[PDB]
Amino acid sequence: HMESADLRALAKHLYDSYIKSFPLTKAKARAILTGKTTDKSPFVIYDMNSLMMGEDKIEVAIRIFQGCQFRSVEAVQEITEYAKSIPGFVNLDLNDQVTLLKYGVHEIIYTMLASLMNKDGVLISEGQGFMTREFLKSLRKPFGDFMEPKFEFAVKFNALELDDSDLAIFIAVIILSGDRPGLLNVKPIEDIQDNLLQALELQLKLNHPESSQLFAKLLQKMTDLRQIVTEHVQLLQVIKKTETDMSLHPLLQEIYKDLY
Amino acid sequence: MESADLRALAKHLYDSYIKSFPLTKAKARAILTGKKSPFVIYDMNSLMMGEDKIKFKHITKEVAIRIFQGCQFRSVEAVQEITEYAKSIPGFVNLDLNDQVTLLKYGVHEIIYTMLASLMNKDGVLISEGQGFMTREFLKSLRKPFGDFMEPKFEFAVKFNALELDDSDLAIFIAVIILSGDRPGLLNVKPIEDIQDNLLQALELQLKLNHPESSQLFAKLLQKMTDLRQIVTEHVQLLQVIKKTETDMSLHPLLQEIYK
Numbered sequence: 001h002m003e004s005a006d007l008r009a010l011a012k013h014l015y016d017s018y019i020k021s022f023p024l025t026k027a028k029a030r031a032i033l034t035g036k037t038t039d040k041s042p043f044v045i046y047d048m049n050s051l052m053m054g055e056d057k058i059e060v061a062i063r064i065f066q067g068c069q070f071r072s073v074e075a076v077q078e079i080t081e082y083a084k085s086i087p088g089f090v091n092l093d094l095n096d097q098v099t100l101l102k103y104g105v106h107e108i109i110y111t112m113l114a115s116l117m118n119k120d121g122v123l124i125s126e127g128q129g130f131m132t133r134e135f136l137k138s139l140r141k142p143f144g145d146f147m148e149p150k151f152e153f154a155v156k157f158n159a160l161e162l163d164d165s166d167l168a169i170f171i172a173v174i175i176l177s178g179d180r181p182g183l184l185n186v187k188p189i190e191d192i193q194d195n196l197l198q199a200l201e202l203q204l205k206l207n208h209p210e211s212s213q214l215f216a217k218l219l220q221k222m223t224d225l226r227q228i229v230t231e232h233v234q235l236l237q238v239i240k241k242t243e244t245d246m247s248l249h250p251l252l253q254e255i256y257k258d259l260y
Numbered sequence: 261m262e263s264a265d266l267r268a269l270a271k272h273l274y275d276s277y278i279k280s281f282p283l284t285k286a287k288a289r290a291i292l293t294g295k296k297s298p299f300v301i302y303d304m305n306s307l308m309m310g311e312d313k314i315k316f317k318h319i320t321k322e323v324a325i326r327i328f329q330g331c332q333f334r335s336v337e338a339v340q341e342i343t344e345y346a347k348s349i350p351g352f353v354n355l356d357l358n359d360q361v362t363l364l365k366y367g368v369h370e371i372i373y374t375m376l377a378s379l380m381n382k383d384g385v386l387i388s389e390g391q392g393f394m395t396r397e398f399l400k401s402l403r404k405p406f407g408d409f410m411e412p413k414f415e416f417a418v419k420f421n422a423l424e425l426d427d428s429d430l431a432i433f434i435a436v437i438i439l440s441g442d443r444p445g446l447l448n449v450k451p452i453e454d455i456q457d458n459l460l461q462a463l464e465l466q467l468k469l470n471h472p473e474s475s476q477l478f479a480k481l482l483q484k485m486t487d488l489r490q491i492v493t494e495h496v497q498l499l500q501v502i503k504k505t506e507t508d509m510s511l512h513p514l515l516q517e518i519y520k
């Protein structure tokens with residue numbers, strides 16, 4: 001246990017890093033998804049023709065799939081930058097640094113994807129675009145079904161009503177998982193996470209006092225996260241045996257080589 | 261400001277510098293001179309014994325590369341320590357977040373070189389928080405590109421250490437470097453220079469009181485930031501060559517990400 005002032009200090013630290021590391025915060029995403037801003041209004045893609053006009057303003061299922069893979073790579077870069085700032089992370093064994101990231105980036109991506117989503121769609125191109133869930137759900141053969149459970153998770157997850165400051169600590173807890181497969185020094189990983197959890201517990205208590213057992217309930221959502229990554233990796237594997245024309249990113253190839 | 265305030269600011273920064281960096285200059289100096297002897301790497305065999313005995317954090321391809329990379333992991337590790345320290349400089353965290361990021365982005369190299377001198381003498385360099393000592397003859401003698409990559413760090417430390425600065429001098433000098441208002445892309449230079457003029461004020465008084473016998477040490481120390489900039493460009497231009505010359509450098513995709 002740390003003194004509560006130390007945890008408050010840790011939380012502020014991490015919020016600052018998160019702000020610096022991720023250009024599109026939940027705070028900015030919500031201001032776009034709600035409205036009353038002629039300054040911030042997205043272009044909305046709901047069919048093939050509006051997609052064709054989307055390029056001029058900012059095969060189809062592949063074009064969209066590949067574009068998602070490059071946004072994903074962009075996010076691993078941002079998450080890796082953030083992780084580097086978590087107190088203790090860079091002092092870990094170098095091999096374990098990779099393993100935490102190998103197993104953490106996806107669970108973090110979906111968490112952060114939820115900030116860019118509502119029941120009806122998802123922000124793209126750094127807020128400038130909005131692609132509707134119904135349009136994606138209607139893409140051919142294997143795709144389309146690739147996007148829907150993220151929406152199903154995002155709707156429930158977003159009802160916790162967390163903000164960027166809450167999320168910064170929650171992301172950290174994810175990265176610092178000492179039960180990831182193949183870690184060499186689990187002990188120093190748990191000790192760090194024991195601090196992030198303490199920081200998160202306090203942060204949640206103060207920022208959401210009317211919201212009973214949010215800490216518990218937020219920890220339970222990592223159950224949902226694990227399954228989404230399972231279903232997703234099973235899906236990517238099918239496209240790999242179906243589409244031999246297209247490829248993955250070197251960085252992406254690494255995250256999904258082995259893994260539970 | 262009143263002299264008591266500069267004495268206070270200097271006391272403040274020394275206190276912060278102590279907590280932020282594991283191995284002070286005072287402690288390194290006690291190690292490099294004499295009076296638990298550090299494990300000494302002076303050739304290929306003693307390095308092989310360095311791991312599996314003291315099992316070093318950064319060194320675990322082939323030998324010269326392994327060492328070259330190990331320096332970069334320590335550098336990344338140190339950047340977090342400097343970032344922690346910067347957060348305590350009065351006023352720093354109250355600046356525009358983009359500018360905090362810019363000041364660190366362009367400052368860490370000069371601070372790393374500066375502090376590297378505290379761990380160096382003419383004959384070698386401390387590693388692993390003092391537990392190791394790697395000889396300059398060994399580093400200087402690594403093959404083709406790598407040998408010459410390490411020797412200038414030593415060439416700098418020897419001249420710099422002839423000023424005979426201590427941690428209380430160095431804490432302010434570091435602060436002055438961070439708060440450099442000529443870094444590219446700053447949005448609000450005024451408050452950065454305002455802070456720098458105070459750190460300079462504290463630095464000038466500190467040197468006068470701590471080194472009264474040493475005329476124009478303030479001046480001579482400002483002249484060394486002329487040196488630092490040229491050494492950092494030389495270094496960066498040198499890394500550029502190794503990246504384009506050595507194809508034996510294949511690290512894990514996620515590692516290259518962390519260590520870029």
Ligand SMILES: O=C(O)c1ccc(-c2nn(S(=O)(=O)c3ccccc3)c3ccc(Cl)cc23)c(OCc2ccccc2)c1
Binds near residue numbers: 318327331372
């Ligand atoms: O303890 C520390 O504070 C500490 C800080 C920096 C280095 C260190 N970094 N680099 S660098 O990555 O090229 C670099 C340098 C300046 C700016 C940017 C990047 C070095 C290159 C040569 C040398 Cl001799 C040292 C360094 C450090 O080396 C300890 C070490 C030496 C040999 C094997 C393993 C570890 C220690």
